[PDB]
Amino acid sequence: QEVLTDFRRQDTIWVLALQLPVNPQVVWDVPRSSIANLIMNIATCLPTGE
Amino acid sequence: LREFFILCLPHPKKINNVLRAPYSWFVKMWGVGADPIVVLQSTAGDDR
């Protein structure tokens, strides 16, 4: 959060082209997308170990 | 082999020691940029 805590912050206009949180219904409305969603989940969240 | 052998005759050890590196560099670098590439699949644990 350091981007918002400099001494010039009170004279700043912020531009934000993307928003959070994301609506999950948009992702899960894609037709027959269970396997693609599973692959993306594995590719973005699976850790490695011993 | 003959063209490499003839060139080294005036000074074998010096010229050979000079020419060690480029040959190994060529062998290492051959084929890394071909658009279709052939590999042998392998599989092991998570650690590289």
Please indicate the experimental technique that yielded this structure.
cryo-EM
CB pairs A-B closer than 8 Å: 6
Q: Given phi > 0 = left and psi -120 to 50 = alpha, else beta, which region is A45? A: alpha
Contact state of B45 with A49 under an 8 Å Cβ cutoff = no
Distance CA A28, CA A37 (A): 8
What was the resolution (in A) of this experimentally determined structure?
A: 2.8
d(CA B32, CA B29): 6
CB contacts, 8 Å: A48 with chain B: 46-47
Residues near A19 by Cβ (< 8 Å), separated by ≥ 6? none
Q: Which residues of B touch A50 (CB under 8 A)?
A: 45-47
Q: Cα A14 vs. chain centroid, distance in angstroms?
A: 19
CB B16 within 8 A of CB B8: yes
Secondary structure element (H or E) that encloses residue A45, with its range = helix A34-45
Q: How far apart are CA B34 and CA B32, in angstroms?
A: 6
